[PDB]
Design a protein around this ligand. Structure first.
Ligand code: 017
Lengths: 99, 97
């Protein structure tokens, strides 16, 4: 798809069988999701955003379908204003900015 | 141009002759930069880690990667300068995959 930016670039993702809405976020290095049902082991991590730092659970090697395209990578689970798909997974699905 | 996302999508911007680097950010509703005169309205914007207080300037002419845009620029303690959707739309930016 070609996604214009008059509205928030929100898409449906599928992550461990669950459907969620997430924001395609070119300003995000990392992918941050509010909650997820992955059975794997995880590691505690901290990340900073515009407002300060948060604690997240780092899951590696998570399978996620982003608007039909498969990605397999790191997902951070913690408090975000909205689920964000960052560059670590945008690169995988072949996303570029074009103007 | 086409900008891949292997690295942070940073471009040069220019305000009133003043050069800065800024992130082309589809996740940001509005453009926010760290640096002053003119009329401005108080605003708060939030993301990971909470909210920051910013000054809202309207109808600012900015040049983004060589393309002129006119619109809202927020000014405040953002850790990175951010070109948001309000101005990305004006330079005809899309996300493609
Ligand atoms: C979280 C989004 C819904 C909104 N953010 C835009 C976002 O692209 C920021 C933009 C950003 C970029 C760098 C530093 C702070 C904010 N990225 C971000 O928080 O990414 C985090 C996840 O990956 C990490 O990589 C960078 C920070 C971490 S935001 O910066 O808070 C923001 C919110 C409102 C406006 N108007 C402008 C910006």
């Amino acid at each position: 798809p070609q996604i214009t930016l008059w509205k928030r670039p929100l898409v449906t993702i599928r992550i461990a069988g669950q459907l969620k809405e997430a924001l395609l976020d070119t300003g995000a290095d990392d992918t941050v999701i509010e909650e997820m049902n992955a059975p794997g082991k995880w590691k505690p991590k901290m990340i900073g955003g515009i407002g300060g730092f948060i604690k997240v659970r780092q899951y590696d090697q998570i399978i996620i379908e982003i608007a039909g395209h498969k990605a397999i990578g790191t997902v951070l689970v913690g408090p975000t204003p909205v689920n964000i798909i960052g560059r670590n997974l945008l690169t995988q699905i072949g996303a570029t900015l074009n103007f």
